[PDB]
Amino acid sequence: FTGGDEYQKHFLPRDYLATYYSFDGSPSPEAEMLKFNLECLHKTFGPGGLQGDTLIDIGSGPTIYQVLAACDSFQDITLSDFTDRNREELEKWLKKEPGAYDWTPAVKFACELEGNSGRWEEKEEKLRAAVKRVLKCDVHLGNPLAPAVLPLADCVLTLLAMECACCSLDAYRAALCNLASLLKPGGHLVTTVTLRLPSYMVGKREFSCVALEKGEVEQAVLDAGFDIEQLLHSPQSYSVTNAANNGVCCIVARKKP
Ligand SMILES: Nc1ncnc2c1ncn2[C@@H]1O[C@H](CSCC[C@H](N)C(=O)O)[C@@H](O)[C@H]1O
């Protein structure tokens, strides 16, 4: 199973973005996966949804799409990733440096969900302003952000990373408890997990995944001290050449006080 050393040495954010977030304008399963997540996130963080002071995104990778809805409802956002190269990409985007990845199609889609795709620059800058820090994280640690110690948060967000970080169902179950430690009682975990996925491509390089069934994920969430508040499933899959998953599950879970 590809572990931390393999990520640190060999995970290339530019290859990751080209595989899963190409914005080539074509009809594609990768685009549909992004759309599904953007839809779930608008439901979760838009009008009538979750709101609070602090949100921590765990395993952000080099991507910012996952917090476009969130920045309307959480004023202090932390992004975090295990892989140094990924944190560098995030900082390029936040700083508006020349090498920053162009997320415009996703920003526009996020705004479209809110009823006006024309306000995309406003959303882009609102997110950028809301992101206060970019930190190392490791979900296997009791405190995933160690040696940083943040105040307990209103929300922990994590998309498509836990199943890459964890080699087994047991590792995944423990990692959920580690995320739960970052939350206030009554706080929420928001997570999207790909199902029955054993591996995924990042450009020409293969990385491992733990193959999880949604029943297992659901039990793991309950066992980590949460209840399930919302659950949104789709059969949507990536190209099987990239990642042969059996659909996808987005879960909003509340840490029981
Ligand atoms: N132990 C660990 N703790 C936290 N993140 C880890 C990790 N091991 C691997 N990762 C991260 O898991 C991510 C998987 S790719 C998912 C990226 C992004 N959240 C998206 O929505 O596309 C990578 O960014 C990788 O660095």
Swiss-Prot record:
GO terms for cellular component: cytosol. It is found in: Cytoplasm. GO terms for molecular function: amine N-methyltransferase activity; N-methyltransferase activity; thioether S-methyltransferase activity. Pfam families: NNMT_PNMT_TEMT. It is an enzyme of class 2 (transferase). One of its GO terms (biological process) is amine metabolic process. The modification N6-succinyllysine is found at residues 9, 92. Keywords: Cytoplasm, Detoxification, Methyltransferase, S-adenosyl-L-methionine, Transferase. Widely expressed. The highest levels were in thyroid, adrenal gland, adult and fetal lung. Intermediate levels in heart, placenta, skeletal muscle, testis, small intestine, pancreas, stomach, spinal cord, lymph node and trachea. Very low levels in adult and fetal kidney and liver, in adult spleen, thymus, ovary, colon and bone marrow. Not expressed in peripheral blood leukocytes and brain. Its EC number is 2.1.1.49, 2.1.1.96. S-adenosyl-L-methionine binds at residues 16, 21, 59, 65, 81-83, 86, 138-139, 159. Its main location: cytoplasm. It catalyses: a tertiary amine + S-adenosyl-L-methionine = a methylated tertiary amine + S-adenosyl-L-homocysteine + H(+); a secondary amine + S-adenosyl-L-methionine = a methylated secondary amine + S-adenosyl-L-homocysteine + H(+); a primary amine + S-adenosyl-L-methionine = a methylated primary amine + S-adenosyl-L-homocysteine + H(+); dimethyl sulfide + S-adenosyl-L-methionine = trimethylsulfonium + S-adenosyl-L-homocysteine. Functions as a thioether S-methyltransferase and is active with a variety of thioethers and the corresponding selenium and tellurium compounds, including 3-methylthiopropionaldehyde, dimethyl selenide, dimethyl telluride, 2-methylthioethylamine, 2-methylthioethanol, methyl-n-propyl sulfide and diethyl sulfide. Plays an important role in the detoxification of selenium compounds. Catalyzes the N-methylation of tryptamine and structurally related compounds. Monomer. Belongs to the class I-like SAM-binding methyltransferase superfamily. NNMT/PNMT/TEMT family. This is Indolethylamine N-methyltransferase. It comes from Homo sapiens (Human). The gene is INMT.
